[PDB]
Amino acid sequence: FGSACFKGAVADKYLSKYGESSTLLANGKWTKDMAKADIVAKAVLDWAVENGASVYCHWFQPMGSSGNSGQVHQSMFNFAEDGTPYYSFTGEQLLQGETDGSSYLSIDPYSPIFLREDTVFIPAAFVSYNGDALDEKTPLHRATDALDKQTKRMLKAMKYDVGSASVYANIGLEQEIFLTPRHAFYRRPDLQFTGRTITGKFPARGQEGAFECMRQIQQECFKMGIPLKTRHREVAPNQYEFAPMFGNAISQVDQNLMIMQVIEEVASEHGLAALLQEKPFAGVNGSGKHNNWSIGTSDGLNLMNPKQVNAKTGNPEIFPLVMAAMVSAVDKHGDLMRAAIASPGNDFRLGAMEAPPAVMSTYLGPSLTEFLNTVKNGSLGEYAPKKKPLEFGSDTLPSIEVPAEDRNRTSPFPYGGNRFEFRAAGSSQNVSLVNTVLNTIAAEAFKIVADRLEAGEKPLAIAQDLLKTHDKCIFNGNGYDPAWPDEAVKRGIWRIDAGCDAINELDSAKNVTLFEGMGIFTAREIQARKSVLLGHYVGSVEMEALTMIDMINQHVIPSVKKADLGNPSKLVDAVKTIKGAVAQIHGTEDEHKAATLARTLRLTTMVAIREIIDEFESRCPPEDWTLATYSELLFF
Amino acid sequence: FGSACFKGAVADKYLSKYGESSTLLANGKWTKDMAKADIVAKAVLDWAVENGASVYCHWFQPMGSSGNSGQVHQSMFNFAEDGTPYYSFTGEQLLQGETDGSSYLSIDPYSPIFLREDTVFIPAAFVSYNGDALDEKTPLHRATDALDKQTKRMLKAMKYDVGSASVYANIGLEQEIFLTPRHAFYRRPDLQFTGRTITGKFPARGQEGAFECMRQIQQECFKMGIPLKTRHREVAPNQYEFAPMFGNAISQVDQNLMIMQVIEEVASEHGLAALLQEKPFAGVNGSGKHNNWSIGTSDGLNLMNPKQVNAKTGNPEIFPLVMAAMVSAVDKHGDLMRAAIASPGNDFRLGAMEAPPAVMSTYLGPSLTEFLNTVKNGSLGEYAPKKKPLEFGSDTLPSIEVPAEDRNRTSPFPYGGNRFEFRAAGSSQNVSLVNTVLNTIAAEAFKIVADRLEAGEKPLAIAQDLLKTHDKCIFNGNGYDPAWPDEAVKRGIWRIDAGCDAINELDSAKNVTLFEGMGIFTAREIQARKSVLLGHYVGSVEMEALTMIDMINQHVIPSVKKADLGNPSKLVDAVKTIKGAVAQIHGTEDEHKAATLARTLRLTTMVAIREIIDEFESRCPPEDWTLATYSELLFF
Amino acid sequence: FGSACFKGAVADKYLSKYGESSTLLANGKWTKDMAKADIVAKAVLDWAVENGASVYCHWFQPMGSSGNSGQVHQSMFNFAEDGTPYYSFTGEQLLQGETDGSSYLSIDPYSPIFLREDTVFIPAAFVSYNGDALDEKTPLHRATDALDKQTKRMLKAMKYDVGSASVYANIGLEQEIFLTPRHAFYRRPDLQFTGRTITGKFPARGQEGAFECMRQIQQECFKMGIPLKTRHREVAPNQYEFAPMFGNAISQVDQNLMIMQVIEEVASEHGLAALLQEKPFAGVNGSGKHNNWSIGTSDGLNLMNPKQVNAKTGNPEIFPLVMAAMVSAVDKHGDLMRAAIASPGNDFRLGAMEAPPAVMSTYLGPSLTEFLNTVKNGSLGEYAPKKKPLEFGSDTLPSIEVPAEDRNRTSPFPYGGNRFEFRAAGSSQNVSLVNTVLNTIAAEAFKIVADRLEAGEKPLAIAQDLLKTHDKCIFNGNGYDPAWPDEAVKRGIWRIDAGCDAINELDSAKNVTLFEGMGIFTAREIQARKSVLLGHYVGSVEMEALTMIDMINQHVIPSVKKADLGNPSKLVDAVKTIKGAVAQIHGTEDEHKAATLARTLRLTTMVAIREIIDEFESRCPPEDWTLATYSELLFF
């Protein structure tokens, strides 16, 4: 409906009062202007005042804030000498904010100003006083700008003009959320403090208003201006996927963050709880958040649609090169993609059956694979996934046409026909970093091909050179094969089984040269980003450890003593071990070393302790097990 | 009413808006057409939008999915550049879907596109990318096609033309459901995870809104347009039978599946639970799902009605021949029927008092038996079950007329006067497989008789030959006699006491030659089907075993310790034994071997453990028994 | 009101639509007719459809079904090719049903087709496929027909014509029901499974919406067409008697069964429970169901009204003769009456203070006794119980007139002034068998007197002969005297203290010759009836035993252990004893032997066990006694 999103027709409704329209809001040039800034400030002031809002808060995503997004509130109504609450909201209040960098928020014109409860949320970018990008919005803006400029350069170098069209990253975010009874949520301290179950015996080993909740989600998003296309269940119990369609990554990351938020408070309203963690329950499918990422222009041109590219430009050569470029990007910076997804919860999703393993290998599909191979051999044609017939052996049953591309779900970076469905991204982790890295690697490859074009090199020769350089990362087989990681390592594809090492790869020489090359970060900027990510990971692991300590001492040991399930001295020794592990974590200074110790602890010592807890729970009566068990959380 | 079923008059209501009618929807040829596909897509889009539906999900039944039916949701409203939810639903969205074959859904035009909640469910057939039938809908379609073509061939070979009339399997599905207090259902983990009570002491040894619930079922089926004829209680406590009348088997299997789904969700709404398992309670009558199967043409001709056949065709020989055909089919493929009913729950129903034993012997009734015997001797007349008088010795009581056929309830395949009431089918198991095997064996028999007719053989001689070949399977006496199984074995009738062996009989040489002969399956197809069925059975047994482990470790042992009912070391040994049994189950590779071990475990070791648990429960106070006892589940 | 009873004016309301009236329904000849059958089928179809009913179920009482009455449901609305629920109910659906005889229901035209909830209940008689009467309705019909024909014969033999008037048994059924808090009912397993308390200590030794409930009963019976005359309390706590007035026994037995049912579900609605057992509580008055039985013609002539007989016929000799006839009947078949009342619960009512002892001796009253004695001496006058004055010694208090018959309550078959108030009948047991035996013995006596009249013998001489033959059974004194049974045995009156022996007397040579003489049963029929009754009794005793096993193992032993009321080893030995007794019950083949063992068990072993449990309960605190005690059940 747009009633809670100052964009498009709703924005125009009040911009026309001052002779403006949503066209002014779309480009974002109004922030540079002064009179337009005050005009839109008055318009949004009115919009909020009859929407039932009186406070405007600037909105931002702090460094490594997976939950999830901070804000600063300010009253937009003042009091004069008479002492009356008269609404007064100026452009300076709209653009500038206040928030400490810590060991001056600025609005994001490309993100829609939206509204919740009686407060209008104004998305904004967060920096330090020096100027360092201390958020995820500013790096993503820099990455998108570099992507746009490099795309324009390389298109112009091959005799194609986009005019004033703006290039960006069109992304859909298949956000998956677990829904739990809030009564059981209150009985699981790990979910309260970490969002994922650090322990709990899954029933039957493991080798396998609720409808009101997401209908309220859907009606909210209608009134909220979010085109939430499809919400539906998933394989795991009470795991609901919301898949808004593609849009500018700048807006879409904020869309995803606020969708996460509104889902959280709606579940709280419904007497439930929205676990956004990547793997809130061990033994079930991980709650992944696929990022359908693609290159999209303002006028709707998509670089992953060869037919659309040929129709709009007339040069078939565009689609392979950029694809090869993207392939090169992966083969150049797959670790960085592994770095992007490296989040506390996501370390329980890589390598499992639901999510692809830690090998960052792209999947172009079979037919596209031999098409690019033929291009590399010196034969460029036109990729076209012709649909083959499919009959079911019955005349009554219709004969359908299905694409010859036998689609794959085992790849971290598969080409889903018309886009890259990067499935490695996690639900709790905001994809902002993922889009930053994807945009910057695309921009690097695009700059390389543009420079080669400007040097006079034929686009063909660039295609063969890049393909023969980076065809190793292309993979089409079953990625869930246990014999795949070592084969990929032999091939040379990026593969980091450790999230800690993945993050530590951020400040590598190649990655740093990339970041200043595309202007995404400075050395200090990327060093601070890596430091924050490592600290976030180690802190999440530390709080999981402390919650385990509290669970053992408060729930597991008392339950064992009450039910007389044997000597709990093993659990006491486990508490000593985990406390010592936290001691070494806090006693080491190297951030990567601390992260490695934390990951080793989480994946080995806490897993063994969790197995011990599950053994003690299987023999514990339900009344004695104070912690709510997986049966209550999942099956309700 | 049809308000939630896009069929018949309701479908015509919106097809007339585009100049069409329900006649187009009936034949199913619209899927082949292009413009008609878009027209019906628009019509169903409207039907959904003013019914209050915004998401369309393709609907299918996976291999061996007894619960029960998967679906993929997609929004039929899109957003343009302005960002408004405009409803747009095309034919491509209607026909083709997305779902992984796994180690491209297509619509089922012969199944009614129906609606539930705010989602329109579109029944569809599920295959693999290769083309292999990975569902039950496609095998049923192939079986019905083969049945129709063979029936048409054999009718034409004997000078009878059906024109454009379509032959199919008219079936009624007497679906029986147990209704349990959901409060007790949540206290029985076995019902939560397996649907049937793996343990629990029945009171008194065993040798013997609720009305709001099925009135809501009835009003739903009205507003949903399911002609649910009769819902009524049964011998067992809270066991309710729903008996929708005859219809095309292709549509009727979906009708049964969705009836199961709606009953489950309504019971959940009413604070109850709908146990669909075959034998949810040991000691009471099994919840069977009788399949009233018959051969029915489009114009209403029924092959089991000799009078109707004579009236419509004028050739009395049709009814006996075809009868022997089905008789031959049974005597040729009774194991296959035993294979069809072989489901995890159904192994607790065969051989009991409620359901017929594991001897797949048909019952034609006495008078029909000597009629067919006389035909075999070379004397064909006209079967006619004349009704004999029945007086009660009182002039006040009316003198009635009852058919001379003393009907039998102890047979697995009795001829209920005008149909085959195959009572061996189970409630949880979808009858789709049962209809596939019945249709393919009928098609084989009809093909044999048609080939003999085309060779010039008199229909009479075929009748005597087939009857003298396959009269052994005919049985009229008491099937519940303990001396019946060995008598049938000496007779040569098919009898598989083991569901595992029944399923393993699917890939037999004769069965495989049947399946490619009728085109129902390929060798790979039937091998995959047998593999899936065996895996489903062994997995269900494995989860019953694991749930048992959880019950003793979590409930039975703590209850014994609290109530001081003696040493629970016997239960600990039982847990060790069941864990070891699961270990051998997971340690063997042969699927049939695994299924045999699982069945032996379930029928012997788990039964003995259940007896021990019942002994401990009989001496346990009700408050100490955390698990809800049969008295609470049944008598509420 | 008749709104839920298709009879009389309500039936005529819709029979007039087809030119018919309730006169057609009254005689029952419409079932023989074809067009009338379809007409009444359409009429009842309408009556149901605007009463809010959609399903018709045939209704019957199975052999020895004391609860209570089975039914088979069928939809009376069908679906055509269009698929619409069109109401279509034919005569064949009305008359013919389906139900297994087991180791083809036909309507009862003399019982009113009635209606409950959304289902129209159609009373029907249940037989086997062979033709054997496998219910109680058909024996009652045969007995009533024999009674009518013999009464007509004997009246005509003495120059009295009844024309087309129909003779039958006019009976009132003083049905007594105990009402218990359903919360307490759920805490007593015996009441759940047997309906009577097998144990429980009565407070104070034993030597002594609720109003909403029976007002709802009364308004239901008003809307139900049931003329429930008087509902009122009784001596025992919460024991309510409902006394519908006299009517045809064929209809009145169904009235009683459906009253029992509707009371059960009304009590369930009111959060109560309707205990229908004969002696649901040991120590209080038994819940007897007096059968006020008399001979009544269609035009209202009553054979127990001498004044009415003289007025209508003019021959005073009718009333004495027939009386001696019934007297003879008792003196010939008192055991059979003792057989008729022989039911599981009723064995706890015979011999107590509330109900007369096991001596089946009739009570004609003093004045009638010497009147019949004078007739036997050869002096017949006219019986007339002239009312004697009764003054209270106060002029203010009115002087009343009271019958000289000092009425008695200690007799099993007293003559209550104008009818036989056979008080031995039990509440749970349906009186259908009682009416069968009374009608057949009356028919035998009438046949004997009619044969003597046709031989030319004077009615007087028959009177003296029968009186001197059968005057021993006449008793006027206090039947509760402990010395009465021995005096009656010396007199030769029938007296069976054992219900098992009472039932076993059914197949005696005299009883069998009676049953084929009046045509009530064949030898196979009576043998099956006796077998069913003995099996019912032994099964009820066996489930009482099993429920007791469950109570001691589940409630009494845990309560004793928790409250530390001494060694419960005595209760363990009692469980061993009762289990062994059930073992001998199941190990013997003679049905009478099994019943005798069951009765001995019930009256001795479980009585002693009940005394032990009461001793343990008296010392048990109320919270420790999980079973609900008599104080909670009776005083609420």
Question: Other C-beta atoms within 10 Å of C577: how many?
Answer: 15
The Cα C306–Cα A604 span in angstroms is 102
Q: Judge whether B89 and B56 are in contact, CB under 8 Å.
A: yes
The Cα A430–Cα A424 span in angstroms is 12
Chain C residues touching B392 at Cβ < 8 A? 106, 125, 127, 131, 133, 138, 141-142
A451 CB burial (10 A radius; 0-12, 13-18, 19+) = middle
Q: Judge whether C550 and C574 are in contact, CB under 8 Å.
A: no
- Which of C44, C42, C65 lies closest to C53, judged by CA? C44
Q: Pinpoint the alpha helices (H) of A69-228.
A: 91-95, 137-157, 182-185, 189-193, 211-224
Closest residue, chain C, to B234 (C-alpha): C72
Can you tell me whether residue B413 is helix, strand or coil? strand
Q: Which helix (H) or strand (E) covers residue C53, if one does?
A: none
The Cα C20–Cα A93 span in angstroms is 90
Q: Which helix (H) or strand (E) covers residue A586, if one does?
A: helix A569-587
Give me the sign of the Cα torsion angle A181, A182, A187, A191: positive
CB-nearest to C558 from B400, B409, B621 is B621
Could you tell me the two tokens for A457?
A: 């090199």
The Cα A46–Cα A6 span in angstroms is 11
Q: Which one-letter amino acid corresponds to residue C227?
A: P
A77 in contact with chain B, both atoms CB, cutoff 8 A: no
Give me the sign of the Cα torsion angle B11, B13, B14, B19: positive
Q: Judge whether A334 and A374 are in contact, CB under 8 Å.
A: no
Query: Can you name the residues that pair with B58 across neighbouring β-strands?
Result: B72, B122
Interface contact flag, B397 C108, Cβ < 8 Å: yes
The Cα C355–Cα C425 span in angstroms is 10
User: What is the DSSP-derived secondary structure letter of residue A117?
Assistant: T
Q: Alpha carbon of C529 to those of B625, C72, C245, C535: distances in Å?
A: 42, 23, 29, 10
Could you tell me the two tokens for C400?
A: 């009343």
Could you tell me the two tokens for B313?
A: 């065709």
CB-nearest to A393 from B104, B138, B550 is B138
Interface contact flag, B392 C109, Cβ < 8 Å: no
Terminal CA-to-CA distance of chain C, rounded, Å? 33
CB-nearest to C192 from B394, B399, B635 is B635
Q: Judge whether A35 and A76 are in contact, CB under 8 Å.
A: no
Closest residue, chain C, to B231 (C-alpha): C73
β-strands C119-125, C55-60 pairing: parallel
Q: Which helix (H) or strand (E) covers residue C7, if one does?
A: none
Q: Judge whether A260 and A175 are in contact, CB under 8 Å.
A: yes
CB-nearest to B32 from A8, A215, A398 is A398
The Cα B419–Cα A30 span in angstroms is 78
Chain A residues touching B538 at Cβ < 8 A? none
CB-nearest to B106 from A8, A398, A406 is A398
The Cα C541–Cα B233 span in angstroms is 27
- Which of B394, B235, B399 lies closest to C137, judged by CA? B394
CB-nearest to C141 from B392, B623, B635 is B392
Interface contact flag, B557 A619, Cβ < 8 Å: yes
CA angle, corner C333, sides to C328 and C334, nearest 5?
A: 95
Could you tell me the two tokens for C66?
A: 């004391």
Residue pairs spanning B and C at CB distance below 8 A: 117
Chain A residues touching B554 at Cβ < 8 A? 618-622
* Residues present in chain A in total: 636
CB-nearest to B400 from C73, C83, C96 is C96
C583 CB burial (10 A radius; 0-12, 13-18, 19+) = exposed
Can you tell me whether residue C129 is helix, strand or coil? coil
Can you tell me whether residue A36 is helix, strand or coil? helix
Q: Judge whether B112 and B412 are in contact, CB under 8 Å.
A: no
- Which of C558, C547, C560 lies closest to C616, judged by CA? C560
* C-alpha neighbours within 13 Å on the C-beta side of residue C572: 9
Q: Judge whether C53 and C3 are in contact, CB under 8 Å.
A: no
Give me the sign of the Cα torsion angle B95, B96, B98, B101: positive
DSSP states of C498-553 as a string? -HHHHHHGGGSHHHHHHHHHTTS--HHHHHHHHHHHHHHHHHHHHHHHHHHHHHII
Dihedral Cα A276, A281, A284, A290, nearest 10 deg = 20
Instruction: Report the residue of B554, B586, B624, B625 to disrupt the A interface, i.e. the one with the largest count of A CBs within 10 Å.
Output: B554
Q: How far is C469 from chain B (nearest CA, A)?
A: 32
Q: Alpha carbon of A502 to those of A511, A534, A537: distances in Å?
A: 12, 10, 12
* C-alpha neighbours within 13 Å on the C-beta side of residue C416: 16
Q: Pinpoint the alpha helices (H) of B18-162.
A: 22-27, 35-51, 91-95, 137-157
A389 in contact with chain B, both atoms CB, cutoff 8 A: no
The Cα A79–Cα A87 span in angstroms is 9
Give me the sign of the Cα torsion angle B437, B442, B446, B449: positive
β-strands A55-60, A119-125 pairing: parallel
Could you tell me the two tokens for A217?
A: 């989600």
Interface contact flag, C57 B211, Cβ < 8 Å: no
* Residues present in chain C in total: 636
Q: Pinpoint the alpha helices (H) of B270-404.
A: 306-313, 318-341, 366-377
Q: Judge whether A375 and A542 are in contact, CB under 8 Å.
A: no
Interface contact flag, C75 B230, Cβ < 8 Å: yes
Q: To 10 degrees, what angle do helices A606-618 and A569-587 make?
A: 160
Q: Which helix (H) or strand (E) covers residue B30, if one does?
A: none
Chain A residues touching B28 at Cβ < 8 A? 396, 398
The Cα A277–Cα A256 span in angstroms is 14
Interface contact flag, A397 B106, Cβ < 8 Å: yes
How far is Cα of residue B389 from the mean position of the Cα atoms in its chain? 37
Q: How far is B125 from chain A (nearest CA, A)?
A: 8
Could you tell me the two tokens for B238?
A: 């809270």
How far is Cα of residue C465 from the mean position of the Cα atoms in its chain? 32
Could you tell me the two tokens for A421?
A: 């469905």
Interface contact flag, A204 B555, Cβ < 8 Å: no
Q: Alpha carbon of C550 to those of B617, C463, C558, C569, C579: distances in Å?
A: 10, 58, 11, 16, 11
The Cα C317–Cα C315 span in angstroms is 6
Closest residue, chain B, to A211 (C-alpha): B117
User: What is the DSSP-derived secondary structure letter of residue B305?
Assistant: -
Q: Which one-letter amino acid corresponds to residue B28?
A: G
B215 in contact with chain C, both atoms CB, cutoff 8 A: yes
Could you tell me the two tokens for C292?
A: 């006020």
Interface contact flag, A400 B106, Cβ < 8 Å: yes
Q: Which helix (H) or strand (E) covers residue A180, if one does?
A: strand A167-181
Contacts of C450 (CB under 8 A, 6+ apart): C150, C153, C154, C157
Closest residue, chain A, to B546 (C-alpha): A204
Q: Judge whether A111 and A226 are in contact, CB under 8 Å.
A: no
Give me the sign of the Cα torsion angle C457, C461, C463, C468: negative
Tell me, letter by letter, the H, E, C secondary structure of C184-200.
Answer: HHCCCHHHHHCCCCCCC
Tell me the longest C-alpha to C-alpha distance in chain B.
84
Q: What are phi and psi of B353, to 5 degrees?
A: -75, -35
Query: Can you name the residues that pair with B123 across neighbouring β-strands?
Result: B59
Give me the residue label for tokens 């009304």: C266
Q: Judge whether C505 and C592 are in contact, CB under 8 Å.
A: no
C46 CB burial (10 A radius; 0-12, 13-18, 19+) = middle
The Cα C494–Cα C336 span in angstroms is 9
Interface contact flag, B227 C57, Cβ < 8 Å: no
- Which of B144, B197, B195, B196 lies closest to B170, judged by CA? B144
Query: By what technique were these coordinates determined?
Result: cryo-EM
The Cα B287–Cα B278 span in angstroms is 5
Query: Can you name the residues that pair with B302 across neighbouring β-strands?
Result: B296
Interface contact flag, C189 B211, Cβ < 8 Å: no
Q: Which one-letter amino acid corresponds to residue C220?
A: E
Could you tell me the two tokens for C404?
A: 């000289």
Q: Judge whether A294 and A418 are in contact, CB under 8 Å.
A: yes
Could you tell me the two tokens for C104?
A: 């083809």
Q: To 10 degrees, what angle do helices A249-269 and A432-454 make?
A: 170
Question: Among residues 617-636 of chain B, which lie with CB inside 8 Å of chain A?
Answer: 626
Chain C residues touching B631 at Cβ < 8 A? 189, 192
Q: Pinpoint the alpha helices (H) of A270-317.
A: 306-313
- Which of A209, A156, A191, A175 lies closest to A453, judged by CA? A156
Question: Other C-beta atoms within 10 Å of B590: how many?
Answer: 11
Specified resolution (Å) = 3.2
Terminal CA-to-CA distance of chain B, rounded, Å? 33
Q: Judge whether C588 and C599 are in contact, CB under 8 Å.
A: no
Interface contact flag, B546 A204, Cβ < 8 Å: yes
A129 in contact with chain B, both atoms CB, cutoff 8 A: no
Contacts of B374 (CB under 8 A, 6+ apart): B380, B381
Interface contact flag, C626 B631, Cβ < 8 Å: no
The Cα A207–Cα C547 span in angstroms is 42
Interface contact flag, C141 B397, Cβ < 8 Å: yes
User: What is the DSSP-derived secondary structure letter of residue C86?
Assistant: E
User: What is the DSSP-derived secondary structure letter of residue C376?
Assistant: H
Interface contact flag, B9 C82, Cβ < 8 Å: yes
The Cα A333–Cα A335 span in angstroms is 5
Give me the residue label for tokens 């919301």: A242
B455 in contact with chain C, both atoms CB, cutoff 8 A: no
Q: To 10 degrees, what angle do helices A459-470 and A366-377 make?
A: 120
Contacts of B238 (CB under 8 A, 6+ apart): B178, B179, B180, B210, B634, B636
Closest residue, chain C, to B563 (C-alpha): C558
Q: Judge whether C277 and C428 are in contact, CB under 8 Å.
A: yes
Can you tell me whether residue B489 is helix, strand or coil? helix
CA angle, corner C413, sides to C411 and C418, nearest 5?
A: 110
The Cα B219–Cα B209 span in angstroms is 15
- Which of C405, C473, C419 lies closest to C291, judged by CA? C419
Interface contact flag, B193 A205, Cβ < 8 Å: no
- Which of C504, C348, C127, C535 lies closest to B208, judged by CA? C535
B93 CB burial (10 A radius; 0-12, 13-18, 19+) = middle
Interface contact flag, C145 B232, Cβ < 8 Å: no
Q: Judge whether B367 and B383 are in contact, CB under 8 Å.
A: yes
Closest residue, chain A, to B137 (C-alpha): A397
Q: What are phi and psi of B127, to 5 degrees?
A: -130, 180
β-strands A400-403, A106-107 pairing: unpaired
CA angle, corner A101, sides to A95 and A106, nearest 5?
A: 10
Closest residue, chain B, to C582 (C-alpha): B205
Interface contact flag, C131 B392, Cβ < 8 Å: yes
The Cα A429–Cα A341 span in angstroms is 7
Q: Judge whether C558 and C546 are in contact, CB under 8 Å.
A: no
Can you tell me whether residue C61 is helix, strand or coil? coil
DSSP states of B336-348 as a string? HHHHHH--TGGGG
How far is Cα of residue B146 from the mean position of the Cα atoms in its chain? 20
Question: Among residues 503-562 of chain B, which lie with CB inside 8 Å of chain A?
Answer: 519, 543, 546-547, 549-550, 553-555, 557-558, 561
